[PDB]
Design a binder for these strands. Sequence first.
RNA 1: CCAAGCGUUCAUAGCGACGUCGCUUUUUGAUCCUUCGAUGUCGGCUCUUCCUAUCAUUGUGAAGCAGAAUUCACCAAGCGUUGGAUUGUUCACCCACUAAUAGGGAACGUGAGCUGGGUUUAGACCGUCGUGAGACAGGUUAGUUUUACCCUACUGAUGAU
RNA 2: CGAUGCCGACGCUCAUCAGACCCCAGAAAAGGUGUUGGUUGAUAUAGACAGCAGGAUGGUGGCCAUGGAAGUCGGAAUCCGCUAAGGAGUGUGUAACAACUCACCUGCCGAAUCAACUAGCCCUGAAAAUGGAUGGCGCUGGAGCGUCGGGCCCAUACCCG
Lengths: 199, 190, 176, 52
Amino acid sequence: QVLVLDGRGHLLGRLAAIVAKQVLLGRKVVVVRCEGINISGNFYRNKLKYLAFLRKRMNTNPSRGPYHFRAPSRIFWRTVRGMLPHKTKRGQAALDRLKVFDGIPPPYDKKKRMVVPAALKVVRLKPTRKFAYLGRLAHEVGWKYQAVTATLEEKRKEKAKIHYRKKKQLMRLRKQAEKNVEKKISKFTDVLKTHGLLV
Amino acid sequence: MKTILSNQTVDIPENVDISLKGRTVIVKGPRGTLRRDFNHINVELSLLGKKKKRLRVDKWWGNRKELATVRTICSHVQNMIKGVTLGFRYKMRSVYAHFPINVVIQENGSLVEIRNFLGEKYIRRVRMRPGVACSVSQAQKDELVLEGNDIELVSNSAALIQQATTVKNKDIRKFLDGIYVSEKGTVQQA
Amino acid sequence: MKASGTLREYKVVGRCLPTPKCRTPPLYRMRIFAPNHVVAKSRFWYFVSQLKKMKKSSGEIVYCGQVFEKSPLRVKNFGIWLRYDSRSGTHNMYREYRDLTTAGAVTQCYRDMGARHRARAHSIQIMKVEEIAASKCRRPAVKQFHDSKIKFPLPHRVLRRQHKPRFTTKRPNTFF
Amino acid sequence: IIEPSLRQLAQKYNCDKMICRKCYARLHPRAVNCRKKKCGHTNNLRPKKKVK
RNA sequence: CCAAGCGUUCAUAGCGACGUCGCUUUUUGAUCCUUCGAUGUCGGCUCUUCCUAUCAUUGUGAAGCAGAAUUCACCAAGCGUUGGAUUGUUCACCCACUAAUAGGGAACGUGAGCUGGGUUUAGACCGUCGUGAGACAGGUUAGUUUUACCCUACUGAUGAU
RNA sequence: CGAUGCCGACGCUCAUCAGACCCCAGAAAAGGUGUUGGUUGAUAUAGACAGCAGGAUGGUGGCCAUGGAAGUCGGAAUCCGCUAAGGAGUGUGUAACAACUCACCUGCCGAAUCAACUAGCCCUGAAAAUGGAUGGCGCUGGAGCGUCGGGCCCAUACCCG
Ligand SMILES: [Mg+2]
Ligand SMILES: [Mg+2]
Ligand SMILES: [Mg+2]
Ligand SMILES: [Mg+2]
Ligand SMILES: [Mg+2]
Ligand SMILES: [Mg+2]
Ligand SMILES: [Mg+2]
Ligand SMILES: [Mg+2]
Ligand SMILES: [Mg+2]
Ligand SMILES: [Mg+2]
Ligand SMILES: [Mg+2]
Ligand SMILES: [Mg+2]
Ligand SMILES: [Mg+2]
Ligand SMILES: [Mg+2]
Ligand SMILES: [Mg+2]
Ligand SMILES: [Mg+2]
Ligand SMILES: [Zn+2]
């Protein structure tokens, strides 16, 4: 149902373009670890780009917008909002089909995360080019929860490591079991090999 | 123009041990270990031979800027070899026309206190980098000896002292006072 | 002329129209690299006009035919002598390319002259094309492939099938 | 008074420099172009004038 | 920008001829596109904001920078940039204090914000001009300054999902 | 935002003001040892170009011009000997002594090096006033620039009805 994406190692704009089209077609999208997102170009020039954005404010009443969100999740959310017709009912409904998070809170912490190879930095950037981290960028333009997100992301990874070790334990048993019942499943294994399901 | 291959080799002394974990070099020698990460350069590191051990750095299909990083890695690694065997010793002389520069070492050579620099009442305190030890040279007056295993740490520690004693709002061509690096040597001569 | 697609080498023969003064005018030939023959004949009249008191009206094309590559399955080094106009002058160049067909080396020349000098094909006049032996080549980019034991890897192999799948559970691998 | 050897040590860091004519940057004595982009890496350098 | 000269010496610390390339729209022009069933025409006062081509202050580089004082240049508009005599004045000049007393824009910011000294109606005087009626980017004196309760913005006050 | 979600082709480019499509809505002269490509000319296996020695004098401190300049500040001349070589002199210093460094040369090590031009992209030159516009988001194995391929998208145009 819901397409869950991992924000780590993805380029801001490319992910937004793909994410924007998915929610316009009616799919629910969740993006996690928005602080792991990357932007091409060195950090300083990306920091300048946002500091220029911070200068844009209604001279007569700054409370009337633009609103300069400092969380990497909201920065990404506003980037996806920039690729949608968000002043029409169609665009706002699409925008409601996207959820954006810093770190991986529940229930997405215990769910498989997909990536978008067309937006992956390793796929789209020459390895010599400089790049920026949305988390460091956000932290340096007023985001207040970099340290807490990291602290909680450190606890989740420790739990994920325990889960993986249990999965590896169950696969070691599975391979052992396939050896103990090799005679009882030989006929069914030829059917799979005959049809490519087992090489 | 991209050049098919560009490589340079480093010869490892028999008393030094080099191990690679990807692009991380670990040089272990008589004076300790150094570890440096070259993950920011897309090269290929190899260890050749078993008796006369060498380290090769290769760069395939590099441009002019990329090729220039092949020898930079080699020089760094040599400095790491030089560090774990001979060490780095930076000697600094304090120059003053009227006011002696009184230097007091504290915390086993990890904190340098400078007093009376051009007569100032302010006390300057410079914290050495980890793994660097400063001491007053017993062989000569007005001379500090910075010793360590990492050239970047040792030579950066001396830079802090030299910039701490900076003259201000004067003609520095005239007011030459300061503590300056006077020699870049090794801890053990060989 | 627009250097559209891979160019072809054409052998074009023309002459002045016979007249009472000279009942048999001499024949002239040109090596023309063009997309098709209709372009090939047009460029012939542009070149002979520059060298002779001749033009399409007072002359005819005796033969237009494609010159096929003689060793399409053999690697060769090509030397190309050309003149071109820049924004602020005219220049002569000598360039080298490694290819299998002489028309391929010329096509590489147009794409290369466009890339490195923003030269549109209407400003480029290829004067001469020769096949050159490995010992007589001057350009370091070409000479580095003159190595009987050449070998090299393919580092950081970029993923080109980036939308099949568009969304995947595993991250790609660039090492092979 | 400073010993002549120590005078040369300090002068190595305070006097033996080139000066960019366009941006006044302090450069090493063997510099042929400035290291600053603000001047476009110009080659208009001059010696740091000696104090009399 | 070039560099003949100046700078005792020395083109380029600081300047810079003869030449030449630009930028700005805080000067004046040129034009007449909008407005003549009317967009209130100078200056001041008050109040906020913005620019930088930076006077002061912070951090710096260069001097023909010994110190002090000063000059050139960089990042830089955060914070300042005043009290007065004469004048309607903008502009100017001087007195005094100051770290400094920088320069500008916002319909040459700002008249349902004021004032009305000037300009620019009708009265009147002088000079020059005209036979005269009369005229004068020539002086002089006296000469009504309208309306918000509407929409928005803004300031505060109830409140609404 | 309809259509490249092509396993598109070859290059160029990093910008702490990048660039991005007739009219058109922004930039010049002049510069860069950033990077790429070219033209010309040199020198190097009789082993070049850095890097690691000596040499400042024999006629002579050439005579003129000097209060005084010995190679060293100007104005015309600017020769030989011994030799691996040595300008009758590149830079060092005053009011004069005094002073040293290059031209030169060979000891060393062993493949390309040097100079001047030229043209692409980038960069400096590059300062304005409400907050601000390659249309926006954004984009750097390009969603930028140059040369080119298939494919696809849709006008009230073209074809059949
Ligand atoms: Mg706040
Ligand atoms: Mg002073
Ligand atoms: Mg003079
Ligand atoms: Mg008209
Ligand atoms: Mg009206
Ligand atoms: Mg009005
Ligand atoms: Mg009105
Ligand atoms: Mg400024
Ligand atoms: Mg006004
Ligand atoms: Mg008003
Ligand atoms: Mg009024
Ligand atoms: Mg009045
Ligand atoms: Mg009147
Ligand atoms: Mg009269
Ligand atoms: Mg469009
Ligand atoms: Mg019909
Ligand atoms: Zn400079």
